[PDB]
Amino acid sequence: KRGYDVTRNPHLNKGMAFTLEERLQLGIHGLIPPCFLSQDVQLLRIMRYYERQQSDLDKYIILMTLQDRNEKLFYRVLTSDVEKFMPIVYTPTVGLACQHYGLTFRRPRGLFITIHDKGHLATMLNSWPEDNIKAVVVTDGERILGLGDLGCYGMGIPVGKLALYTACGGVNPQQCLPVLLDVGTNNEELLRDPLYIGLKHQRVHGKAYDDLLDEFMQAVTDKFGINCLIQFEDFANANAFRLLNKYRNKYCMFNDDIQGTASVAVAGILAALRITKNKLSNHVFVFQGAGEAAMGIAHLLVMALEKEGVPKAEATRKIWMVDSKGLIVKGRSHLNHEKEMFAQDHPEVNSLEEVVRLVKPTAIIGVAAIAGAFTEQILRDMASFHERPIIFALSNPTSKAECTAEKCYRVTEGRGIFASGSPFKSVTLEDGKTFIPGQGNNAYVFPGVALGVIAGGIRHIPDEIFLLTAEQIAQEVSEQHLSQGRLYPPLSTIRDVSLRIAIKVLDYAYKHNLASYYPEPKDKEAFVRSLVYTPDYDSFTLDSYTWPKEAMNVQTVTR
């Protein structure tokens, strides 16, 4: 683009980083103050107004205003300290910010598609001004991680999710499109809220809902190609699994709340095997919770056990799940399709504490959002059954964790191998022993998986890709970090980890003939590197050249 419109284009606007030469060539000289700053100075300037804010919500506001006007500077900020800003642009801040302030974007960020637009979605896609779309993150806003049904305010979550695609993975932000599907909201606070900007009726459900999702997938892939990545985020439990089984083999589709969760949890389990010095086959798993996360983790664990050599039926029997009505056993009431797959041949047990005592698991995984469920008795039991028990308190936020890092290290007398979903500072026990517990962040998974899928036009995303991604993450951890109790690589290395994930995934796709991109690159690393988006400003070079003087003399006819 040229002229005034370039300053309103978030992908090309440099603000005062436009050189005088660039302003003149673009025909915008005089629209910008008479000062010429480097990007590094722009970073310093914006960071001063960043620290003056008294809340995380206000810092999210500042960053959204910056993303509105200068996308290159926005990702300069995010990548300068990814671990610091990830909790601001995404969870847990984005949900709290949208729940309190609504949507604060002053430039349209994506598409709002309602159930009442059924039959006209193709036309609505045409309102988005980018034609080269390769990744779509979509939500209906029914299960925002930690806050529930936010309805139309849930648009902030795909916006924040995609920011991490780019900041942590190097996915081209211009090829990304966040979509909000508004079928209504069941949040009584929103339906009586006079400032609510979504559909003020209860959620449409049943086939009429599925019809809209069907048209959405068809419309997106009709306009952008069947290779378009479509990631589902923050869908309720029943819809999440149904939609995944329906589309995962027909479209380029995955659900991060199920599959990304599974891979990073399995990654922590594999890293802990390097400490326990046993095989995955030697383990017995008890799940505190039996929803989206627990089902995803359990299914990927079985897939990993199968690769070690354990047949599927045998591997399934190593998994015990406790839901809100007790242990899931054959013949219990209140079971469903997913739950019957893991129903053990056992009498009814009501309490998690009793299940720990009966089955004596080598690892317990908490994904039920019940605070303190890993009691002192449970931790002490686990530390007496096995030398190095594995304690995953994955529920979010921190106030809903199954236990604290300090309580696990103290009660297990420093032998528990711990990981959480929420960040815990380093623990040092009375005896001097020091532990640095790791956080199982989904951003370890979905940025690199998306980069390799987009890079090679990987047509579908089978669960083998999430398994090999977990194996890759597990081997990122160094021996020193294992010595400290860290089961995950540092977040400051996330762009390197994602790039190595993208190459492994790309290599896997070509070997299974799943990649669409042609021809297959010989140097997969160089290929993926060439697609990584950098916060560095591009240059508006002109590409002027001349012809040989003799050729120009002969080709120019005068009198």
Add this chain to the structure above:
Amino acid sequence: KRGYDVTRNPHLNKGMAFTLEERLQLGIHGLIPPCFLSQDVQLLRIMRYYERQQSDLDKYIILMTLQDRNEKLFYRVLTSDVEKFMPIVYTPTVGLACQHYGLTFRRPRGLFITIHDKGHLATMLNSWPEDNIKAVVVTDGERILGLGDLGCYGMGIPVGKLALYTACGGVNPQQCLPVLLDVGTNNEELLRDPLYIGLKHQRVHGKAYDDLLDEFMQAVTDKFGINCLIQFEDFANANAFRLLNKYRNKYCMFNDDIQGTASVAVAGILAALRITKNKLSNHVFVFQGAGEAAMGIAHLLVMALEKEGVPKAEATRKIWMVDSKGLIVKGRSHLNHEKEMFAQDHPEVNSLEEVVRLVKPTAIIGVAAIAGAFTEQILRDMASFHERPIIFALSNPTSKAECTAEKCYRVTEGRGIFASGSPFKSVTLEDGKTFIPGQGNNAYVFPGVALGVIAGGIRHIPDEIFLLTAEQIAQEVSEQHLSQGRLYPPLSTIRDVSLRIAIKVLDYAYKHNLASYYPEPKDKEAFVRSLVYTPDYDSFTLDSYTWPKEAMNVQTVTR
């Protein structure tokens, strides 16, 4: 315009006030949340976030963000209570906001032209995306009313000034262009400020400066027409008068700090004549100060005295001016071109207090920014020389006023006729007498003058136009308001007052053959009304029609 770009166009974007029908016709459906609000609801929504701000500066920030995205809603806010928002978008807030925060506009608002762009101004005008420009407000930022040399940060002042053109006058905002001329700054705080975004050298002066202003006037009128209104704002004293005498007869040009100040001050004097029941010829004026304001007021007073019948030389001798070195008398040192015009035949007098006693003025006008200069002795002297003395404490801000309204009413025992430049709440003396002092706001003048000039293509703005504007303002005051000590009409009536000013001015121009617009309208009020900009959203009607059925049958050829 159509498509995505309409949401980024501040003059067409309605936000959620776009009907579903409008979104579909524009091809933007899905870019806006699924809610359809009236402008009145938008006003309520934005006013809630307005009241939560703890400072005027933060409220200016909120309004600038709104002007960035929705100009119709912005002027809906301003016109809902003009008296309330005028101090926020313009003085005194705008100067304090820009001095502390810099420039906060996230959409280019005008043109920055530097001394180093000399010879290339025509090209720079082409960066502004509006071709139909009819009004330009320009500053070099050397004398920001109340804060001094703000350099490049002075861009906020023309932006705020033009907002009042539209809010108080109905001038079309899309035809308005604010310009900042950066020749440097002499503000030592800015030159050592690492965040300053202007030219970091002292101000260029002399002919090299005038050369740049010469090219600026030529470039603007070459591109937009010689009828383009060019108002100068916040120029230092020497430059202000020199530039005015140079351009006022060659271009459509005026300086509000000199001429708008003069007309509203003379307006207060004329309104006070309705209380004093004497002629302007019966008055003796003493000026506290002898700068831009005092010279402008004095020159217009002489022009008014001349119209009552007093010859120029005699009328001049009714004006006494005191500067920083005492009374201005023939043969004094430290006089200049303007000051010699009012030099009295009198010995040197050092103090204002002594001048009041010697000459016994009927009216004292304070424009020197010296706090408390109208002492208790001066007020008591004035109240003993004349029955109804006129006390104008015009210096800004309130802390620099020559006296308070309460001190004038108390010391003169309720007989002083008072006006100020800063707002004073109503005074009630011990004896029950109640006074509602008026504020001499320049916005009484420049919005209506600009509307009539723009409406009729008035080629030049002679001082007779500012005189008749003052006579119009004076007669706006009702008898009841005079009974209360109010010398100016209420600010809530400013759009009506400006419209009546615009008609009078337009009528004056056609009678003196100064108007360019052709043909002369018979109903001047209807003509000017048709040019008043309203905050009401326009409609994207399609204008579809058909031909007579028989005509279409005959004009359509098939097989």
Add this chain to the structure above:
Amino acid sequence: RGYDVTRNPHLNKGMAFTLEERLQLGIHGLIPPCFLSQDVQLLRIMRYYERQQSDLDKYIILMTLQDRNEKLFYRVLTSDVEKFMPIVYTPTVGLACQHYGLTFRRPRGLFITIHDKGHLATMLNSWPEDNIKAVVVTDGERILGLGDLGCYGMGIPVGKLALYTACGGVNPQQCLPVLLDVGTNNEELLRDPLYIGLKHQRVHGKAYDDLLDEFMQAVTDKFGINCLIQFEDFANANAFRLLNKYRNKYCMFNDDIQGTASVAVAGILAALRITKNKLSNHVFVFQGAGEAAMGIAHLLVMALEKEGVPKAEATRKIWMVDSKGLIVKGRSHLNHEKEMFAQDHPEVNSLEEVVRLVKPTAIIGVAAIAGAFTEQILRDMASFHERPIIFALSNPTSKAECTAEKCYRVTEGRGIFASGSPFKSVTLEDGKTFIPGQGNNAYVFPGVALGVIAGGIRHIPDEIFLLTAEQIAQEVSEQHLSQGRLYPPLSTIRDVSLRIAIKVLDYAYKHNLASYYPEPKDKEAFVRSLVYTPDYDSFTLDSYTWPKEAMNVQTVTRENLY
């Protein structure tokens, strides 16, 4: 910028785009790999032009050239304005559209129909140019020499506007041709399957007048009250009524009435330099009493009054003959403007008898009757006065009152001749040679348009047409007059038009009709700077740097921040 410049005829230079301009505009690869001068382009197109051997075929090639490269189109036209004026305008344009319809492959103007009433402002927005300063409008009812061509009449404003630019230097991009289609009365068009206009008869009455009223209002609302609107080829009654209704309300004139009058009077004033007598010593007989006659006669009275003759005495010098005979007081079949020139005289039915009684010093044929200037009429003139004036203005050549040869032969070399149609040089049997001039309207309207547009003259009073006539009459050299030439050479039309623009501009500021300000001190330097040239424009980017030290202080990095 981009591919679209090659489709923009105002910017497209074809193979004259240098490599550097092609790369800069982002069009490299769209044009063959050769770079041509405009002079070479001119030579190539001229070769194609001469291989054609129809005037119609030469019109088509020039139109497709105008379709793609406007600067080159006008370089062709200006290289020999006399050669191409007949091809792009009268008489070829009328015959071209009559036979081929509209050959334009790029939209040239606006078609506004009676059925579009109430939406004319919307249709003006279809024209991609916003800065229009001259509009030529027709309804196609009286195409000069051909009659009612209906919607095929669009070719005439397009050809007319090309002469505004070629002879006058008016900016072509600021001009808009308009066809108002209210139907047609041509029975051959109404029955024609290929006809592209409204296939019903011409709407007349209030609905017609209201459409024209809206057109004037819509054009000036969008383009400004100063926008020149010139009416072309309307029928007689509409032409005069519309002229009287708008000439004081808008910037308006009718070239068939006023431009014709201007160039006819110019020829007469030039002829006074041969006859060496005052205009008040003359008696005029008009063959024809219609659009052209009334225009010329009214301007003749004006020039007689300026010479000082009372108006009633001046009007009495004019005798008019229509299709019923002499226009007397007390005849039947006499209209409005006809009573103004009726004479207290017995009825006379033949032009021959009128000439024998009145013994006029000048006869002017504007009736389109071939051979009306009989040998008897010519022989009578030459015996009544030593140098009689014979103006055979009817077009085309076949409908002229007499040929130049016949005038010079029968008048024994003493007749002063001018025609509307171009007659070649005449050499009589005794050896005497004459070079008869053509009273071309292009002598008048390009210079008047240029002066009016340059000054923002709000209205065009007939004094401007009179002073234009006086200017043209002074242009002719003394040598050319000795050879019978009453008009300057058509090759000088651009210079003549510039000089006319200056006088018109001088007149306008003296009587405060010019709205452009500031008034230019030097009227010619002012108009010169507005003449459009066929020179290709430059694509030079305005690039520059700030002084080194000033730029170093304004460039902030992480090292030099504090």
